[PDB]
Amino acid sequence: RLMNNGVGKGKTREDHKQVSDQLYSAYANGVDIRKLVAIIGEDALTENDRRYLQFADAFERFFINQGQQNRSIEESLQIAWALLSMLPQGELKRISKDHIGKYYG
Amino acid sequence: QVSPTRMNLLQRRGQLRLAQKGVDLLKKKRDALVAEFFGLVREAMEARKALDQAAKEAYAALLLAQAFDGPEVVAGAALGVPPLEGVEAEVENVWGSKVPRLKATFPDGALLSPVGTPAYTLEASRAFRRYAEALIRVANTETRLKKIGEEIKKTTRRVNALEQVVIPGIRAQIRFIQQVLEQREREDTFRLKRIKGKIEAREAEEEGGR
């Protein structure tokens, strides 16, 4: 509930709430569309659908499946941006474009 | 929901048992349709290959017929031929599904004034009637293969939907009903211990004071 008070400038990076927002929104849409592909075949669909499919698979393989290495908060946000780097900037509809500019590479 | 009694627990066990039999029933149906799909696919590729051989025959004859004669003679001839109409599609009602099979009408032997001056138009026209034969055979095999494939897809999504939805939903209902009925049983066997304490207190407290 109170992640809103843990994030912010002078506590972490300045985009942490927005990054977690965008990761949850994109991964929720990815698992939504795996639920949809669980009914009809894998062709009657659009392109950013497939982009979210590869994003969900790369998410479950890279962000969560860390083994038991010691990821920081800094390397974890770096992995977060390296996973968000497979989406166009016209689809990250939430976060402010300054943090698009300094990051997303 | 349903108000849980001992009747509805057995009614939901019966509904679960019927759905657990229906999953295996539809898997047997999907197996029979797989057997018929691998039946039809080799017949479809066989008719496709025969269509290819008659295609080589008809295209070589058409090139050579417009080649040795002019293009204008076969052009006026082809614009003279009657349109061969009335070709239509009748019933193949199977799996409760009418698929349209195709048959033609073929005005063929009534040649256009059969004293014909070009000599390679008629042999080419017989070759293209053989071409239309093989084409409608590949057509009414191909659409039947497509229908059986989409019915396999229907059955498969129905099996997966029915299993992975309304087996655990009925399991959740049955577990809810067993928890609440056990809870009612526990309340009543608490009331029995309280009333036994009342009986023994009535016999023991009024022993001394009497």
Question: C-alpha distances in angstroms, B78 versus A70, B60, B72, B86, B112?
Answer: 79, 17, 10, 19, 11
Dmax over CA atoms of chain B, in Å, equals: 138
Angstrom distance (rounded) from CA A58 to CA B181: 46
Number of CB atoms found within 10 A of residue A20's CB = 14
Task: Quote the domain boundaries for residue B128.
Answer: 1-210
Adjacent-strand bridge partners of B98: B93
Residues in A closer than 8 angstroms to B157, CB to CB, are 39-40
A39 to B153: CB separation less than 8 angstroms, yes or no? no
Cited resolution, angstroms: 3.8
Half-sphere exposure of B179 (CA within 13 A, CB side): 6
Angstrom distance (rounded) from CA B74 to CA B66: 6
Q: What's the token pair of residue A14?
A: 């300045």
Q: Is B194 exposed, middle or buried (0-12, 13-18, 19+ CB in 10 A)?
A: exposed
Q: What's the token pair of residue A25?
A: 């929104």
Angstrom distance (rounded) from CA B95 to CA A34: 31
Strands B88-90 and B101-103 come out as: antiparallel
Q: Mind giving me the DSSP string for B46-107?
A: HHHHHHHHHHHHHHHHHHHHHHHS-HHHHHHHHTTS------EEE--EETTEE--EEE----
Place of tokens 């048992």: B17
Q: How far is A19 from chain B (nearest CA, A)?
A: 34
Q: Which residue of B has its CA nearest to A40?
A: B157
Number of CB atoms found within 10 A of residue A67's CB = 5
Angstrom distance (rounded) from CA A93 to CA A13: 20
For chain B, the domain total comes to 1
